[PDB]
Structures are given as structure tokens and as C-alpha cells.
Design a protein around this ligand. Sequence first.
Ligand SMILES: NC(=O)c1ccc[n+]([C@@H]2O[C@H](COP(=O)([O-])OP(=O)(O)OC[C@H]3O[C@@H](n4cnc5c(N)ncnc54)[C@H](O)[C@@H]3O)[C@@H](O)[C@H]2O)c1
Ligand SMILES: NC(=O)c1ccc[n+]([C@@H]2O[C@H](COP(=O)([O-])OP(=O)(O)OC[C@H]3O[C@@H](n4cnc5c(N)ncnc54)[C@H](O)[C@@H]3O)[C@@H](O)[C@H]2O)c1
Ligand SMILES: CSCCC(=O)C(=O)O
Ligand SMILES: CSCCC(=O)C(=O)O
Lengths: 327, 327
Amino acid sequence: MPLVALLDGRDCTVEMPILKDVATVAFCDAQSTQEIHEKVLNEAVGALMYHTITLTREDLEKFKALRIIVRIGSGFDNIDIKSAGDLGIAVCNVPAASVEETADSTLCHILNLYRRATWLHQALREGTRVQSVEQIREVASGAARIRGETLGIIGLGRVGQAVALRAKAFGFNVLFYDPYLSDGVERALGLQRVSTLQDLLFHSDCVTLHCGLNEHNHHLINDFTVKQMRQGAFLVNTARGGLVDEKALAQALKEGRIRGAALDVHESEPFSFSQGPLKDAPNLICTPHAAWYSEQASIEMREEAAREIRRAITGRIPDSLKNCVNK
Amino acid sequence: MPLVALLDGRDCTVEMPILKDVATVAFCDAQSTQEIHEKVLNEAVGALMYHTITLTREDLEKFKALRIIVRIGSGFDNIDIKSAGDLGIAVCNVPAASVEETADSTLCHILNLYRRATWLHQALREGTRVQSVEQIREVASGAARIRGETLGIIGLGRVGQAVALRAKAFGFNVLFYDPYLSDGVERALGLQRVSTLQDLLFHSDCVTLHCGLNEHNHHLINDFTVKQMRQGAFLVNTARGGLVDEKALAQALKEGRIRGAALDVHESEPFSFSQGPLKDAPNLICTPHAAWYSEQASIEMREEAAREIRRAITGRIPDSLKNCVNK
Ligand SMILES: NC(=O)c1ccc[n+]([C@@H]2O[C@H](COP(=O)([O-])OP(=O)(O)OC[C@H]3O[C@@H](n4cnc5c(N)ncnc54)[C@H](O)[C@@H]3O)[C@@H](O)[C@H]2O)c1
Ligand SMILES: NC(=O)c1ccc[n+]([C@@H]2O[C@H](COP(=O)([O-])OP(=O)(O)OC[C@H]3O[C@@H](n4cnc5c(N)ncnc54)[C@H](O)[C@@H]3O)[C@@H](O)[C@H]2O)c1
Ligand SMILES: CSCCC(=O)C(=O)O
Ligand SMILES: CSCCC(=O)C(=O)O
């Protein structure tokens, strides 16, 4: 039976009943390609993977039998996809399993910035006593009324759309910028669209990222673009860490140009509050790439991924695949 | 000019331009009646107050000239209202200034329980390193998919309604219980209504409190009713601390019968994580009675309160009052 390897993990229990009579399944628990056994590189026909390992062209060439990579999850910036296709390797993803989880975590982050719940909780853990109204106003200082505020969405695909719909219900005015959609989706969903990133950032009280990370948007938020954002704007990122220059973000937080930021993703993951450019930044909320996570979403995407592998092996690449992203 | 006293605060700057030519304004910065100067008790014609001081009949009798109490805010459980009216004292509130602030903080709490953002942030502050997917699943364990879950709302007045509308947008199935509304409001807003508290608690995955605290609902949530809630249900309280028996809540958190609770209000305020029945309870998020707070809401309710005082003094009690709650 063909070999299929789980690259950056150990647990295969969900995939096993689907793949039993179809593939031999192995895991590598690998943080990098230098940690994969020679057998896998030599023999693996398929590969399952998350976001915690990167495949450059170098890495892909080390595989001598590999015909399919399936990401367990939606983002595939961590695979050099064009090179994979040149090397005759089909790459797929799982686009839909965690859309609402991610939108809900996004809304949770937005609300946490506006209503300061996480910071107020921290404050209480720290032993701050809040006895008088005056003290409530001070400890909660910066907490703001949402109705009439403008949420700017960068990228209006699955998550951005789920986010927009939720945001309307709190009285946000929602703008988006997405240079790759054909026109009319703004009408369909009753949103306002803007042509440029700069228009979005200029008009937005809270800016939230929901685009894939691609060759053209590394450090989309940087020293230049940060300077285009409203004074005292919020920033939210549950998309990809590489869309933001943490050095510019940090300075901006220190200087108060950005009032607060909520980040589930980071340039270098795992994230620590003790290492990197963000080390000392005030007004920062962070989560460990967990916006996607629910038990149902985890199970859902694992089973769909397993099936995609099965379809690869059992049928015809790339015809038998539902979610190949480099045909 | 008549004397008007701000009882449990110092700052009068917002009220002053409205009350200048109408009343002499004083403050008491009082946590209790035993802290108010004799002049105020003797002469005060009106009183402005928050939630941090209580007026029993005893306290109200100590006032010899007092004709109006205006709460700066909506909840008036902290004033013995019936006795005030007997003693010839008009009591008013400010019902509308912070409805959406409170609904938004409520949604923030709900989402924080389901998506664990606050706890995940804490975790990162504590130096937990979350490198692998397996580690993400463990640190985020308990994070759940919202669509199809049931939110049970107890009290469907202003805040409960704003909460319900927001919750629909995340795919919550919304039930409410409110024994004082006439029928049909459920149809108007497209919700499901249940007849008893027990029906609500039985069917609800997350239970959220939005009723006034009154003579009939002290410890609404207690040893008995806690036992009626779903196993692993969440509880949210931005209403009043006295609706919940923290002793039963605590045990329930320890035993895992309630999976998590988010509390902006508490039996004894200010709240400390080092004192009281909740001291050791796991899975607890808390905020220092700040759900109401935004700068606009604060200003809004202060100006409206001031005007109500002005209307009291300038015109006819109780006819000239917009928000007298004991006519
Ligand atoms: N934190 C998490 O756990 C988590 C979970 C799910 C998705 N994500 C990330 O969030 C991203 C969004 O997810 P999705 O499912 O909505 O993806 P999607 O493909 O459905 O939508 C992405 C949208 O971004 C747009 N876009 C691309 N580049 C852009 C740019 N420079 N400016 C503006 N718009 C741009 C595309 O046109 C597309 O409409 C994913 O790529 C993924 O990496 C993170
Ligand atoms: N944490 C905060 O900062 C904050 C802010 C605003 C309000 N609050 C509190 O939340 C409460 C709700 O605010 P609101 O403006 O919606 O009040 P509201 O008067 O508009 O609505 C309260 C509703 O609760 C219902 N009710 C009363 N007793 C009940 C019971 N035993 N079971 C079920 N329903 C019951 C009433 O019928 C009413 O419809 C207020 O009384 C206030 O104390 C807290
Ligand atoms: C199962 S990890 C996936 C998380 C993610 O960020 C993505 O897929 O886009
Ligand atoms: C301005 S404090 C008011 C807060 C509150 O809980 C209420 O008014 O109901």
C-alpha cells in the first residue's frame, strides 16, 4: 500500500478509519524537513500537514515519490505551491471547516478591544480594586461605544464575509477592500467597498485581516501603511502573521498611534510575550493560533483531508480532488 | 437655591452646566449613609447616585428635605424604592444610555467562554509555549462551535433584546424566559419563549442574565436551580450580583457541572479573586462592573440624570419626570 505521512504531528486517529484499506499511515512529528526519516522522503506518496512546517522548493525536491500534499486547514502560504505544481505535486486544502470558528474568534477579539474584558480581567487578577465609579471609568478607560464605528475588512472571502455579517448586528459600519473579487458582492451582502488599501485604512476605526498571505501582501501593514491608519485605530489579525510588520506595529502601540491590537497569528510562531519585537508593546492581546479551533472543526477538517488523500490514491490526480489549489 | 448631593462620587463636572442656575451641587464621596455630612441629610432636596451605596428605609428617613433620588444608570435594586415612595420620595433612573454597551460586553463574555480568548491570552502571559497543533488543541481545549448551540436569556427587556439580536447573527438558537412580558414579543423578534425558569435552564447551553434584581429573584441561580442547568453549561451575568448564589456557583465550577462563567457583577462589590466564595473556582472570568461603561454612555446618562433633577426642581413631582420608577 502507498505510504502517507503526517508531517508536523503525531495523532492520526481520526484519519485512520478512512485511510485503513488504502494507505499505510506514518507520522513524523517534524518541525522541519531535516527531521523527516529517509523512508518518508523516499517513499511517501501522500503527505498530510498543518501550518507548523514550511515546504520550500528545496524541501519538495527531497521527496522522490510524493504525488499529493493535503493541508489540514485552509491557509497554504506555508507551502511553495507553484514549485510543487512544477515538480508534479498536487496540493490541496480544507477550506470550510473553521470559517465560523474563526469569524467568532475574530468578533471576540474586536469586542475585547472595544469593551476591554480581557484587560479588565487581567486587571482584577493583578489585584486592582475597583470600588468607585470614578475607579471604574479609570480602569475601563478607552472602552468605547461600537454603534457608528467603522470596521474595515481586508479580504472578503469566507471568513471576512462571516465577520461582516456578525459586525452589522453590533451597529458597525462595514467597509471592505479585496482587489481580487468581481464587483457586485458588496451589493449582494449590503456592504460598502473601497478600491485601495489606503482608502480602507483611512476610513476605519477597527481594521481586521482576513486575506490569504501571498507573494504580493507580505508586510501589508508596515511603516508606510501603518501611517495611513486612523489615529487610535484598532488592529485585529486572525489571518497570517506575515501580513504585519511587528516592528512597525510595536512602535505604533508604544506611541499610541494604534490604540490596541489583537493577534491570533504572528511572524514567528509559537509566539512569546518575552521574545521578539512585540516584547514590550502595550495594549496587545494575543492567542496561540487557536481561532480555528473547535472539536467539531478539528474532526471535520481531519476527516475531509483524509478523504482527499483517499481520492488522490484511489482515482486520478488532479481530477478526483475537490480542493486542489494549484491545478 | 435647593441643595442637590452626589452621594457615592466626587466628579460633578458633567452635571454642573445643566444644574448651575437651578441647584447648589455638593458631593459626598460616600460608600455609606454613615459618611454623609449632617448638612446634606438635613437640607438636600435632590440626590444623584450610582450603584455603590445602598438606601434602606433607615437611610431614607435620615433625609429631612429630600424630594428626589435620581440613579445615574438603570438598575435601582440598591434603593428601597417602595419605602422611598411611602416617605414621599420620587425615585428615577436612566434606563437607555448603556443598553448596547452592556449587550456588547455580554456578547464579549459569551464569546470569551466559547472561544477562550481571554484564557488563551492568560496562558500566553504565563509563558505556556504552544508549538504544535496537538498543543493548540490542549491549550484551547473546551473551545466550542457556536452554531446550533442554545442561548437562554433570562429577562428580555432592553439588554436581553439587544443580546438576542446579536446572538442570532452567530447561529445561536435563542430562548428566553421573562414572566412579566405580555405575549407576542417573541413573535415580533422571532424568538422562542419558555414558561419557566426550569425550562430555560434545561434547554440552554449558555445561560445569560438580563433581569432586574427584585424582591422575588434573589439567588435565582442557587443550589436547587444550578442542578437544573445542562451539564457543562456556561453562565453569564452582567445583570446583578444578587441573582446568583456564588457558593453554589463555585462548587459547580469546581465539580465541572458548570463549564465556565463570566461575571461583571457580584454579590459583594468590589470583587477580588483573593476574597469570597469564588476565591478558588476554576473557569471564571470577571470584570469590575464595567459592562455599562463607554465615554459616550457615561456622559449621556450623567446629562440625562442632571436634567431629571432639574425637572424635579423646576416643575412638579412626579408629573415633570421622564423616568420616575415608583409613581
Ligand atoms: N487563525 C486561524 O486559525 C485561521 C483560520 C482560518 C483561516 N485563517 C487564515 O485567514 C485567511 C482567510 O480565510 P478564508 O477562508 O476567508 O480565505 P478565502 O480564500 O475564503 O478568502 C481570502 C480572501 O482574501 C482576498 N485577498 C487576497 N489577498 C488580498 C489583499 N492583498 N488584500 C485584500 N484582500 C485579499 C482574496 O481575494 C479572498 O477573497 C486564510 O488564508 C487563512 O490563512 C486563519
Ligand atoms: N453590568 C452593568 O453595567 C449593567 C448595565 C446595564 C444594566 N445592568 C443590569 O441589567 C438589568 C437589565 O437591564 P435592562 O435595561 O434590560 O432592564 P429592563 O427593565 O429593560 O429589562 C429587565 C427585564 O427583566 C425582566 N425580569 C424581571 N424579573 C425577572 C425574573 N425573575 N425572571 C425573568 N425575567 C425577569 C423584566 O420583565 C424586564 O423585561 C438591569 O436591571 C440592570 O441592573 C447592568
Ligand atoms: C488546523 S491549523 C489551520 C489554521 C489556519 O490558520 C488555516 O488553516 O488557515
Ligand atoms: C453608572 S453605573 C450603572 C451600572 C448598572 O449596573 C446599572 O445602571 O444597571
